[PDB]
From a paper:
Mutants Y63F, Y66F, Y76F, R72A, R72K, Y98A, Y98F, Q172A, and W400A of OphAΔC6 were expressed in E. coli. Y63F, Y66F, Y76F, R72A, Y98A, and W400A were incubated with SAM and analyzed. The peptide carbonyl at i−3 hydrogen-bonds to the side chain of Tyr63, at i−2 to the side chain of Tyr98, and at i−1 to both Tyr66 and Tyr76. Y66F retains activity, and Tyr76, although within 4 Å of the carbonyl, has a Bürgi-Dunitz (44°) angle incompatible with attack, so both possibilities were discarded. Both Tyr66 and Tyr76 are, however, well positioned to stabilize the resulting tetrahedral carbon by hydrogen bonding. The resulting negatively charged oxygen of the imidate would be stabilized by hydrogen bonds to Tyr66 and Tyr76.
Numbering used by the authors:
A (entry chain A), B (entry chain A): 7 to 385, 402 to 411
Write the structure that this text describes.
């Protein structure tokens, strides 16, 4: 194993709070940190956690091509990896969602034989699902960059969710500190009219970046986007959500091959599971407490845990070590290098706990931490299967 | 404002480390916690952080409809909200991505006039982007539930990414503790053959759930999925990634309306930005260090910060308060109730810092924490615009 590593992490969107515990731990452990974030409280927070940080944002300039900036950002990181250092790069949101230089730097490091990894983070689309109260599963989700959407004529589906990033800089390859002149926004609006119609809703979304702020969740018709006062509000952190225009019917051949009908009625196209999408045009009110829902709630009084349910049955020493492996990158590296040596130095473990850690396999760790009933083993991670039908 | 609130949060996918700082803080502050997670180290961690927790997983049972379980899960949470308590629900990953009961409970609470919010988390798709080294922006992403994909005959795009959740339980509406009998998996494989061809790649993806584990990133042809030994490996935490089959050309009308050509050549369909997607079939090698890349790197020696760059210029007292607002839900609530009273009780703030906190607006906070050069204001969040073209 060569000296030198690159780990790229995210900060999430809302200042400080949306950073993951592991992103923080890698920032603290790093020899050198390079960052690109867009609020000052997050920047100040990062600087309290490591003594050797560099702001990547200084490599943008007026009329300097963004591609040249991204090549420079990547090279600054990889140069320190080649010197044998543990390097961490930090980007706002998820560091691989609509980001060029992270993928470039990781690919170069990997090709030259260094350790290289991206840790996921909370994206602007993750925030959109939470704030607009929608699930990508119901009824599917298409996600594009707005200029790419137009130039490559990417297809829409009127029966699924549509999410468009970078709607505030249609057709722009450069940078300006004061901001974008979004003079080709009308080209996007023309496309949305063609696909959806002039009276179809478009939601202008901006996630709150400070903890006390509310999100922007402003619904407009496609036609209203042509009004100059409304067009002016779309900027560099704006995303569009376009809800479905209609409900898609079921395929009879698939119903039969999956054996879903006992010769009769599947639910109708608009027999929706509560709650319905509030952004869809002409969406009917769905009943939250149907007779079937009331009967399920009545069964709560007599409920007992099923006999095949596996209750947690662990110890402080075992929960402490599993927490340490997740929150201490040095401890994890030590454990990975020698499972047996590490396991034998952990204080207060029971014999079973020690043995499970020595092996490292999931089933062993599960047996050590959960009580498995006889019922279960006289007959496999089974985590809300979602129902869309 | 009525007493009682519901906040639903996520844990991310990888044990403990992928929880956000704000998710942890709300779990600690809650009067009552309800959770549904699928590894025991995460469960044990949650129980160390609040004294009043209930496992929602005990409401599943063999041959009990999942919809009835979800109605029960929702009702247990909302009952405590109606009593005037601050309630937190916890689901693995992102709590609104392929999850029924979170959306139901939040909608009921909101309709009855209680405070209701979802905090985003790291999803299985977020992990997929990071581990497979792909960006949803290049060249767009379609995301579906596998049974819905089949039953509603949802469209594919051979030029964009495809992600399918719940490929281990095609056509199943119920639960079993030992697991799913995935006997209709061949119906999915038939559809993938029709859309992509028998020799097109499909990546079987399972994100690591413990910190020391590696992810499963196993590429197969569509044809290979019919082999019983391979089909057997697909389970309840399996997701499929299907890469594009071809590159989409540019539209001449849009090129002209966005003014991208000076009468000549736009880059060719396969003149890719480094790095290329390694999962695409017959993808050519892309040069990481072209002459333009070498010239950009040569400019690093003479680089200085641009005159319109805004360096961080804050204080310990200001960074401490902004951190507290993000990490202490009680402090945030106090600040939101009375900006001026809160601001005047914060120790050691400068006059400008105090004034910015009193107002609460983003531009005021930015001025207080960053030095704004004369160059800038003699002429707006501008955070990697991604280039896809
Ligand atoms: C270069 S990308 C970076 C995205 C980021 N890595 C992420 O994980 O969301 C910039 C685009 O992200 C979206 N974005 C960034 N901040 C946002 C916010 N606060 N609300 C909504 N969308 C945002 C916008 O579409 C913006 O044009
Ligand atoms: C009911 S959903 C819940 C998803 C979860 N809320 C999230 O944010 O990803 C279950 C599906 O998520 C995906 N999933 C869950 N854990 C996973 C893992 N470790 N790797 C890949 N996919 C996973 C699988 O497609 C699975 O069938
Ligand atoms: Cl969060
Ligand atoms: Cl029931
Ligand atoms: Cl993370
Ligand atoms: Cl340059």
């Amino acid at each position: 194993t060569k000296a030198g590593s690159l780990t790229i992490v995210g900060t999430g969107i809302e200042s400080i709070g949306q950073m993951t515990l592991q992103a923080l731990s890698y920032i603290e452990a790093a020899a050198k940190v390079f960052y690109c974030v867009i609020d000052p409280a997050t920047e100040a927070f990062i600087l309290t956690k490591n003594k050797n940080c560099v702001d990547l944002y200084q490599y943008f300039d007026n009329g300097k091509s963004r591609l040249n900036t991204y090549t420079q950002m990547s090279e600054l990181m990889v140069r320190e990896v080649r010197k044998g250092l543990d390097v961490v790069g930090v980007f706002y949101g998820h560091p691989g969602v609509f980001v060029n230089p992270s993928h470039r730097a990781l690919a170069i490091a990997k090709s030259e034989g260094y350790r290289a990894r991206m840790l996921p983070g909370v994206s602007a689309e993750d925030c959109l699902f939470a704030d607009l109260c929608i699930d990508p599963s119901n009824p599917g989700c298409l996600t594009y960059e707005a200029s790419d959407f137009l130039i490559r004529d990417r297809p829409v589906s009127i029966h699924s969710h549509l999410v468009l990033f970078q709607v505030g800089c249609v057709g722009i390859a450069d940078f300006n500190f004061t901001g974008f002149d979004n003079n080709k926004f009308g080209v996007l609006v023309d496309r949305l009219e063609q696909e959806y119609g002039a009276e179809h809703p478009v939601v202008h979304y901006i996630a709150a970046m400070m903890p006390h702020q509310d999100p922007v969740t402003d619904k407009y018709t496609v036609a209203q986007l042509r009004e100059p006062e409304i067009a002016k509000r779309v900027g560099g952190v704006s995303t569009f959500y376009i809800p479905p225009k209609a409900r898609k019917a079921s395929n009879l051949d698939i119903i039969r091959r999956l054996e879903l009908l006992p010769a009769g009625q599947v639910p109708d196209k608009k027999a929706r599971i509560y709650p319905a999408n509030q952004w869809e045009p002409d969406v009917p009110e769905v009943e939250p407490y149907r007779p079937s829902d009331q009967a399920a709630i009545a069964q709560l009084a007599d409920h007992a845990p099923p006999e095949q349910y596996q209750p947690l049955a662990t110890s402080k020493a075992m929960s402490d070590v599993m927490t340490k492996l997740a929150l201490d990158p040095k401890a994890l590296a030590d454990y990975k290098a020698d499972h047996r040596a590490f396991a034998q130095s952990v204080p207060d473990l029971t014999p079973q706990e020690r043995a499970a850690l020595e092996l490292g396999d999931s089933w062993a760790i599960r047996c050590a931490m959960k009580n498995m009933p006889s019922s279960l083993l006289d007959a496999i991670v089974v985590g809300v299967i979602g129902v869309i039908g």
